Each structure stands twice: as C-alpha cells, then as structure tokens.
Design a protein around this ligand. Structure first.
Ligand SMILES: CCCCC[C@H](O)/C=C/[C@H]1[C@H](O)CC(=O)[C@@H]1CCCCCCC(=O)O
Length: 1175
C-alpha cells in the first residue's frame, strides 16, 4: 500500500518537489554492486563458450544471472490467475439467487449476501496481487537495465583504438539511449507465456461444465488468433527495425543541416537538402504508416476478439438445441474475460517485447565482443596492418630527466603517432619501447568535462591553494578566472562549449600540471593561445618550471626549438634527422485539425461512438434474450434473435477495425503535415534564430518530438480512447439498469477528483525530476568516450566508473520514486473500484424486488471489469498530457518569422550581374533590430575587376560586411550591385551570383558529385577539369570510384588543406564575377596556403575580388584596402599610399609587425607600386 510515501505527497502539496526529496534505493540495488553480478556470469560464459569452441550467448549469462529471483514471482501469477477463474463461478451463484428468486426466503437472502462477501473478497485479493506482481516485475526490469549500462560503460572504457574505427561515438551512445530501454519491457510479461496457455486449459474445463461441447468453438477461434497475433508481432518488429536505418540517416542529415545552416544559406543549396530530407521522410513515413496499421490491427484484435469468441460459442450452442439462461451466459462471458486478457494482450505483448529485446541483445553482444627513462629502439608500427606503409619506421630515441625533446614535422608525419607509441597505444611491430615514471598526456584536442573548472584541474587530486594558484598563474589562467563571475566554480558544459578553445586547452594543460607527473607528453599545447601567451607559457612553465622533468614536445613553433635539448624531425613516418507544464484546448484542436478536413474528424467521432454502443448493445442483447427466454411447447424464433445478434456483432467487428485504423491515419497525417511545415519554417528562418538557440535545442524537436508524434503518441491516444469509452460504458450500464446508484456515485466522484488532483500536483514534479536526472548519464558517457585516451592514460578509470554509477543510481532513485508513486495512486483507484463493485453487488441485493436476472447479470458482468481498466485509463491520461508538451514544442516552431521571399516578382536579367560593380551608400548594419549598430555611415564604390580587401580590429564589422552583401539581416542605407538595389532583388537572385570561400570548410555526407554539384548542372568532364585545376585528381582517383564515390562521414578522410581545396573547387566551378574571400583559418599547412593564394590570383584574375584578411600579406597585392574601426570605415586607399601616410591606421598597424617585416613590406610595396605605376 506504499504508505511510506504519504508524507512525501503532503510535502509535494505544501511545496514543489525537488531532487533532494526522493527516498534512496536499497544498498542492494547500488549500480556498482548490481553490474558486477552480471559481469561475473558473462566472464564465466565467455570461458565456457571458449572451451566449447563456440560463440558465447549473452542470453545465457542473463538467465544464469537473474533466473533464481524472477521465477519466484510466478507465485503471484498463479494466485492472481486462480482468483480470476474462481470469481466468475461465485458470480454464477449470485445470479442464481435472482433466477430462482422469491421475496419470502430469508435463508436464500442470507446465502446471497454470503456470496456477495466472497465476491467482494476475491476482488480485493485480486487487486492487491495484481499490484504486488506488476510492481515487482517492473523492479526486476529496472535492475536488468542498470546492470546492462554498467557493463556497457565498463567495456567502453577499455576499447581498442582500431575498434573505434568500426563503431562511432554516437552509435555507442545510442545503445544506452535507445537499445537498453527495451529491457524494462521484457521482464513485465514473461510469466504470462506459461500462465496464459495454462489458464486457457483450466477455463476450457470449466466451460465444458457450464455449457458443454460448445466450449471448443470459442477456444478454436483463440487458437486461430494466438498464431496470428504472434505472426503480426514478428512482422511488426521486422518493419520497425528497418525504419531505424531511414530515421538515423534523416537525423544525421538534420544534424549537418542545422550545424551548417549559415553556409547552406550562403550557397543557396536549400533546395538540395529540402528534396533530400523530403525523400527520406517520404520513405520513412511509408514504413511508419505500414508499421502503425499492423499495430492498430493488434489493438483492434484485443478489443474485438472477446466478442468474436463469445459469438461463435453461443452460435453453436443454440444450433445444438439448447436454450439460453442468464447464469450460463454471464458465467461464460465472464470467464472469457480472463483468457482474453492474458492470452490476447500479454502473450502477444510478451512475444513482441521479447522479440524486440533480442534486437538489443544482438547489438550489445556485438559491442561487448569488440577488441580491447623513456627509450625507443628500432620501433616500427602500423595503426592498421592493412596499410601499405608503416606509420612509424626504424624509430630509435631516448630521453632522460631534464631533457626537452622537440618533435617536429608535417601534419601526419607521425608526431602524435610517436606520442601514441610512448603512450603504448601504438604497439611495436618491430623494435621496443620502455618507459619508467608517470606519464602526463596532453591530447591535441583539449578534453574538458562537465563540472567546475577546478574539478577539471584537480581531477581527483587534493585541493591545495599554493600549488593550485601556482598552476593557475603558471598556466596563465588567473586573469580569466578573475573575469569569470563565479570564478573557478563556474559551471562548464558537456564539452566546454561555454568555454573558448584556448580556455579549454589551458584548463586541460593546467590539469596535466596539477598531477605533478614525471613524463610530460606535450602535444602542440601552445597553438590555441596568442603569441604573447604562447611564449609566456613556454618560457615560464615549459622552460623554467617543468625543467626537472622529461618533456617530449610535438610543436610547429620553431621559435622555441632553440631551447630544446634535442630535436627529432619526422617525415613520411620515419626519422629524418635527430639533434511548459500545461497545455490548452487550442493545442489539441490544432493537432487534430492539421491532419484532416473537419469531415474526417467528425466522422471519426461517430465511428468511435458507434463502435462502443454496438459493443455495449451486444451484451445487452444477450441479457434481453435471456429475459425473454426466461419469460416463456413454444420457443423463440432464432432467425429473429440469432439474426439481430449477428448484426450487432458484425457492426462491432467492423467499426472496431475502422476505428483503430482511422486514428492512426489521422494522427500520422497530422505528424506528416507538421513535420513539413516545421521544416519549411526552419529553412526560411533567419540566421539570427540560429544564434539565439544552441544546435541541440533545435535538433531535439526533430529527433525526439517528431519521434513521439510518429511512433508513440498515436498509439497512446488509441489506447486511452478504447479504454475510456469502455469506462463510460461500465458506469452507464450500471446507472441505466439500477439508477439509485447515481447517489453513491456522487460522493465517490468527488473523492475521485480530489484524489486525482492531489496526485497530479506531484506527478508533474516526478516526471520532470526523472527526465532531468536521465540526461546527465548520456552526458557523462559522451564526455568519457571523448576523453577515452586521457582518462586511460592517467589510470583514472576506476573513478570514472564510480561516477557513472553515481549518475546511474541517482536516476534509479528518480525512477524508483516514479514507480512507487504510480502504484500508490493505482492502488487507491482500485480501492475506489472495489467500492463501486461492492455498491453494485450489495445494492442489487437490497433492491432485489425490482431487478431481474438478465439485468443483474449485465450490471455485474460489467462492474467486475472496472478494476484493471479504470486504474489504467487515468494513468494513460497523465501520459497524453505529458507528450502534448512535444506537440506544443513543434507547433511553436511552425510559425517562426520568415526571411523575405526567395524571389520577388521583380527579377534581374539572366545576364545580370554584367559588370560586377558594387556601391555602398551611407549603410548601417546590426545582427538584430534590438542590437547596437555594428557598422555605420559607410559609403564606398567597387569597380569592375578590381582587387580589394578589408582590415581592422576585431568586431569592427569584418564578418558584418559579408553578412550585409548576402542580406543575412537586412541593411540600413543602400547597396547597389551592377546599378540595381540589393533590397529589390530576391535572396535567390542575390546570394547566388556571388562567391564566398568560408573560413572553415564543410564537407557534407554523400558523393563527391553532390559535394561539388548538387544540381548536376556541370558537365561530366568539367569536374575533372576543375579537380585538375586544384590538382586533387591524383588523390581522389584512388577512391573506389573515380567519381560518384562515397565520401567518408563528414569527409573525415580528407585533411584540412584538402578540405579547403574542395571549397576552392566549388569556387572554380561556378562562374560568377564577384568573389569575397573569408579569413584564413588556424593550423593550415604552410605550403598549400601559398598554392591557394597563387591559384586564386592566377585563375580569378578576371573577377571582382573582395577579401577579409586574417594576415595582411594575404592581400598586399590588392589595388585598394578598406580599414574599419569601431564599426566605421576609417580608410579606403591603396596599401602603398597608406604606408606612405605614416599617420594612417594601416601604417599604425604595419608598424607593429616589427622593423624587419616593416622594411620588407616597405620595399615590396615600393616595388609593386612601381609595377602598377609603369602602365
Ligand atoms: C498493456 C498494453 C496496453 C493494453 C491496452 C488495452 O486497451 C487494454 C487495457 C486494459 C484492459 O481493458 C483490461 C486491463 O487489465 C488492461 C490494463 C492493464 C494493462 C497492463 C498494465 C497493468 C498496470 O500497470 O496496472
């Protein structure tokens, strides 16, 4: 009865409930312990399977782990199902007292009361057994999931570096998110796989006693259904699993869309991704309609099946020459209610939920069986033996205390591979490695995890102010922490997205120093800070402070190599040299009306009511036939009675099926419509909307909220509506047969709404608390997998495992409160139902002078159903009301403000732009109407085929100028392009016909064709011409196809210079006169960059060129340069003359480049000026 929650409900009505308030689970369910129990039997199973020389079975481990405990609960199943078959036989005796009634017999009146007490006792026994069983199997299910997730995490810590090549982080995280949650549904139903068939046999015997040989026909239909519903259950699981391939591909496209949306806009590619998503969605909904219609036929099987089974049974019974009496019919009808529940719901539900679990156990088995001084001599190793060449060859080196080793060479030279060899992550194929002392591993990609920055630094070490502050200053971190409002206690995101790159890098590095290790493997740590901070970190921390320790420093900063004791140059893998909360009716009306014309939704309501009325009327018709037969040689004309009866069952079967299918049609159509609306709105929504949201907050709408609307929500409505209309049926038949019942009902109804409200006040707190507690788990796994390298290097695995157990058992507390609260509530709705069953039974005996046998048989046969039905109905209603938060979260995106039309009715000439001139008149710009002006007063002219660029301080509007030409947010003032006003041509006129090389490139998933030509407008040989112009041909021809080859995911198989060259290829392909070049990005190689600059100058010599210069040399060829400051055009003049104007800002900046570079620029400026002056 869960009384221990009662004070928490009181607390949750006086207050909102909070995370500290929930009761902790037993020490026996602690995730640390609970995982080791299954890990042990998996070890044993691997041993056995080994000795047998066979594949191990994870199903074997799980049974050999849990079977002892879970087979005990079958005792409740046995006594529950024993009561369900007893209770109808007593009901037969009550109705008997009516069939043979006389008011005079005191002893009979007393006898009937005795059975009314036994029938009431059975009901209360059954109510508590139902709750003791269903509460325990849900806790057995929860234990299995926790043990699973502990094992999945345990393995993932130790995975092989090669294994990371054959399953991605997101797929591992999909195990926890989507695969393990199938286990909670396994344990709930298994015990029905034997109780169902057994109960079928027991009921077969009893019905043989009640109505003789006809018993077989009813069971004959049941053995037609039991295969069929199992076959449907298998095919449903086949269909559903195939949709996962479409849905995951769709979501990965949405991720590259929403992450990339600025560039997709700038290239006007929106048509491409619109079509591509539309086709994946059109395929996916092709399966989801089909998979849904199957599942709707499964629920329409439960609803209708009991009426078919009864109909065939009584059909044979009257042809065999029998006559109906009310005791026989309502005993028979009542028994089939038992077999209907277990065999038709719980045996199919067991089969399909076990079948679905094997899909998860199969994947998890495939995951669990994945692979799992400093002196180096003659070292050679392959990351993948399949490679034709070694990643390190004939390496020999050694480093001793006080030595600093600089590791130098090109990108992919093997420097990081050298560090991996030191780390032991790359084992030798020949040669040897020996290390003594504690390693300090500074990964090239900084690793930062959720917590405090101080938690990131301490990393389990004791806090000590002096050394800690010495690190904070030595890692040049004091200033930032003083700028932060919460200091070192500031909260950090899953990946430090709230932190700058140099911040996360410096925090990582500070962490390394805090450990006070012996061997420091510094992998390019200084590249993420400015030159002043870079040399401050090198000189004080690396040269002065870490001096007493072995250091190997993978660096490109040649400026520091003079301080190294020894330098190792690697090339081509070998050593070169060594020296909310509530929704309103509007959201329901929209969700249904979006799906169809009102003619459909009103027809749907008339089909529902027709189905339910026919369902009630069949049973009333039996009762009426019983009364008639009991009123009477002479006999009823079956061709009348059996006639009309056939119609009522026929209508029930028909509208039951139509009802179930049509709900899925209307609601899936609704979700199809809302997805396209939402997607059109997300395409045409301006960039500003994507700055005011993080990517995950948008992508959740498409991944989760559309997910609920397609799969789970339409089922939940159908499940609710089938139940709810039967509840209204029970109450309506009881009140119609014996009106006086209306009086007790009133207080009982008031108690129901008081009870309901008092629970629901807390329910929306537990649901929230559960949902908020769940996410940190997946966050931790993601952080851990990213840090896999480093966490492993520090030997920190045991702490991280304990942290995952901490998060996991937290959610176990939340889930445990959710379980117990739902049962506290469900128990008492059964208690209200028991009061209803009591009042019906006793009231009928009070009023016995007025009722008659068929009437009482009907009233009771309905009231007995209520116990399971009513407690479920109200708890489904709380799920519908939760999921409508999804439908409200998508509906708000359907109406986001829109960018101005892609095309006006005014359109430019197909030859426009002809001349490639641009003019600015008094323009001002800001990213949003509410914001400050970022650029102001500006006016300028660009002539045909001029070469110019933009310089200034950061935030001067450099990025704003490119944003203005594209009208990403509308301008103040005027810009003309080719004598026509930019605001008067459509965005697809304007954003095409100019070209923009972005600072950071993007490779979309797909073919090299699509990544170069999504329109297939360029001729088949032109890409080879363009590819030859970037000279990428001799690399890409090595792919499995010369063209139309698949790229790797995100183009990860190409290096940054190659990626940028693909963007240069895109520029080469489209022919338009106007080019803006974005700023050069970080760590590009020092050779292809000059090639790019040379090729740009060579090929686009006939274009009008702007540029945003990261470093000035990239544009000192230009005719004129614009100088911005404080959001205003300071200077627009020739670079030479600017350098002549020593007062110019341009000179005031170039003076900062140092005497040598200043002199070089002086002479080269004079030279190019002379060259320009000659003609
Ligand atoms: C369990 C899968 C959904 C079944 C939906 C179906 O419409 C029937 C539901 C009722 C039925 O009318 C009588 C009955 O006992 C079902 C409700 C109990 C289903 C199992 C959940 C038990 C619980 O949580 O208390």
């Amino acid at each position: 009865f869960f009384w221990w929650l009662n004070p928490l409900f009181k607390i949750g009505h006086k207050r909102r409930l909070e995370e500290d308030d929930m009761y902790s689970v037993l020490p026996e369910d602690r995730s640390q312990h609970l995982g080791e129990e299954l890990q042990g039997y998996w070890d044993q199973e691997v041993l056995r399977a080994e000795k047998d020389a066979r594949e191990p079975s994870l199903t074997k481990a799980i049974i050999k782990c849990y079977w002892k405990s879970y087979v005990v609960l079958g005792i409740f199943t046995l006594i529950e199902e024993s009561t369900r078959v007893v209770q109808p036989i007593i009901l037969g005796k009550i109705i008997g007292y009516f069939e043979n009634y006389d008011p005079s017999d005191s002893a009979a009146l007393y006898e009937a009361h005795g059975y009314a007490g036994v029938l009431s006792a059975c009901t209360l026994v059954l109510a508590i057994l139902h709750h003791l069983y269903f509460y325990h199997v849900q806790c057995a299910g929860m234990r299995l999931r926790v043990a699973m997730c502990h094992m999945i995490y345990r393995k993932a810590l130790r995975l092989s570096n090669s294994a990371m090549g054959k399953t991605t982080t997101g797929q591992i995280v999909n195990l926890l998110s989507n695969d393990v949650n199938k286990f909670d549904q396994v344990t709930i139903f298994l015990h029905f796989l034997w109780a169902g068939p057994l109960q079928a046999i027991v009921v077969t015997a009893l019905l043989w006693m009640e109505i003789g040989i006809s018993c077989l026909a009813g069971m004959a239909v049941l053995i037609i259904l039991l295969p069929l519903q199992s076959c449907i259950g298998k095919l449903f699981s086949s269909l559903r699993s195939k949709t996962a391939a479409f849905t995951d591909t769709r979501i990965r496209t949405m991720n590259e869309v929403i992450t990339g949306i600025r560039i997709i806009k700038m290239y006007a590619w929106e048509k491409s991704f619109a079509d591509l998503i539309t086709n994946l969605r059109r395929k996916e909904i092709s399966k989801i309609l089909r998979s849904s219609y199957l599942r709707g036929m499964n629920l329409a099987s439960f609803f209708v099946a009991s009426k078919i089974i009864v109909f065939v049974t009584f059909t044979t019974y009257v042809f065999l020459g029998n006559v109906i009496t009310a005791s026989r019919v309502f005993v028979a009808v009542s028994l089939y209610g038992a077999v209907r529940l277990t065999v038709t719901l719980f045996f199919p539900s067991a089969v399909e939920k076990v079948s679905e679990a094997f899909v998860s156990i199969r994947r998890i088995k495939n995951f669990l069986l994945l692979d799992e001084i400093v002196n180096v001599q003659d070292f050679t190793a392959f990351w993948d033996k399949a490679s034709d060449t070694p990643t390190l060859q004939s390496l020999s080196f050694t480093v001793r205390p006080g030595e600093l080793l600089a590791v130098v060479g090109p990108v992919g030279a093997g420097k990081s591979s050298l560090l991996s060899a030191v780390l032991g992550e790359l084992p030798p194929n020949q040669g040897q490695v020996s290390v003594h002392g504690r390693i300090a591993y500074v990964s090239q990609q900084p690793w930062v995890f959720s917590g405090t920055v101080r938690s990131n630094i301490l990393f389990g070490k004791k806090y000590e102010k002096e050394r800690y502050e010495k690190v904070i200053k030595a890692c040049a971190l004091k200033k930032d922490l003083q700028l932060l409002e919460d200091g070192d206690l500031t909260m950090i995101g899953d990946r430090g997205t709230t932190l700058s790159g140099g911040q996360k890098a410096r925090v990582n590095l500070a962490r390394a120093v805090y450990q006070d290790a012996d061997i420091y493997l510094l992998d390019d740590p200084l590249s993420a800070v400015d030159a002043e901070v870079s040399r401050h970190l090198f000189e004080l921390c690396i040269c002065q402070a870490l001096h007493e320790k072995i250091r190997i420093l993978v660096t490109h900063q040649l400026q520091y190599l003079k301080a190294a004791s020894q330098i190792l140059i690697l090339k081509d893998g070998q050593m070169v040299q060594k020296g909310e909360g509530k929704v309103g009716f509007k959201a329901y009306k929209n969700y249904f009306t979006a799906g169809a014309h009102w003619f459909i939704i009103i027809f749907l309501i008339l089909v529902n009511l027709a189905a339910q009325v026919s369902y009630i009327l069949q049973d009333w018709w039996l009762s009426y036939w019983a009364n008639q037969q009991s009123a009477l040689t002479e006999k009823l004309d079956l061709n009348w009675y059996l006639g009309i009866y056939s119609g009522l069952t026929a209508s029930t079967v028909l509208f039951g099926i139509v009802r179930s299918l049509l709900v899925f049609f209307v609601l899936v159509s609704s979700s199809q419509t809302l997805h396209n609306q939402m997607f059109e709105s997300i395409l045409r929504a301006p960039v500003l909307f994507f700055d005011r949201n993080p990517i995950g907050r948008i992508l959740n709408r498409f991944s989760k909220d559309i997910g609920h609307m397609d799969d789970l929500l339409p089922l939940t409505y159908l499940d609710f509506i089938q139940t709810f209309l039967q509840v209204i049926g029970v109450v309506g038949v009881a009140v119609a047969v014996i009106p006086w019942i209306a009086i007790p009902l009133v207080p009982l109804g008031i108690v129901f709404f008081v009870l309901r409200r008092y629970f629901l006040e807390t329910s929306r707190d537990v649901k929230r608390l559960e949902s908020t507690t769940r996410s940190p788990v997946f966050s931790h796994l993601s952080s851990s997998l990213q840090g896999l390298w480093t966490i492993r290097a520090y030997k920190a695995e045991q702490r991280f495992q304990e942290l995952f157990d901490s998060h996991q058992d937290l959610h176990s507390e939340a889930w445990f409160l959710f379980l117990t609260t739902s049962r506290w509530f469900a128990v008492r709705l059964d208690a209200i139902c028991a009061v209803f069953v009591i009042v019906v039974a006793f009231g009928s005996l009070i009023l016995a002078k007025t009722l008659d046998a068929g009437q009482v048989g009907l009233a009771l046969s309905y009231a007995l159903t209520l116990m399971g039905m009513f407690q479920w109905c109200v708890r489904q209603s709380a799920e519908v009301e939760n999921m409508m938060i999804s439908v409200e979260r998508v509906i708000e995106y359907t109406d986001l403000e829109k960018e101005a039309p892609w095309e006006y009715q005014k359109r430019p000439l197909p030859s426009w732009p002809h001349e490639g001139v641009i003019i600015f008149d008094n323009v001002n710009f800001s990213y949003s109407l509410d914001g400050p002006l970022v650029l102001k007063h500006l006016t300028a002219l660009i002539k045909s085929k001029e070469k110019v660029g933009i310089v200034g301080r950061t935030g001067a509007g450099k990025s704003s100028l490119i944003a203005a030409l594209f009208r990403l947010s509308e301008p103040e003032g005027k810009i003309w392009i080719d004598k026509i006003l930019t605001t008067e041509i459509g965005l697809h006129d304007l954003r095409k016909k100019m070209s923009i090389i972005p600072q950071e490139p993007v490779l979309f998933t797909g073919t090299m064709r699509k990544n170069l030509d999504p329109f297939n407008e360029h001729s088949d040989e032109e890409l080879w011409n363009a590819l030859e112009e970037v000279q990428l041909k001799e690399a890409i021809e090595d792919l499995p196809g010369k063209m139309d080859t698949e790229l790797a995911e995100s183009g990860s198989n190409f290096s940054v210079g190659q990626r940028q060259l693909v963007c240069l290829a895109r520029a080469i392909l489209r022919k338009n006169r106007i080019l803006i070049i974005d700023e050069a990005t970080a760590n590009v190689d020092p050779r292809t960059d000059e090639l790019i600059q040379k090729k740009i100058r060579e090929k686009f010599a006939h274009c009008t060129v702007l540029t945003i210069a990261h470093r000035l040399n990239t544009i000192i060829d230009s005719d004129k340069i614009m100088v911005l400051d404080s959001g205003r055009l300071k200077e627009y003049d020739e670079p030479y003359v600017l350098l002549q104007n020593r007062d110019s800002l341009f000179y005031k900046m170039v003076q900062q480049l140092g005497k040598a570079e200043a002199a070089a620029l002086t002479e080269t400026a004079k030279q190019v000026y002379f060259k320009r002056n000659y003609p």
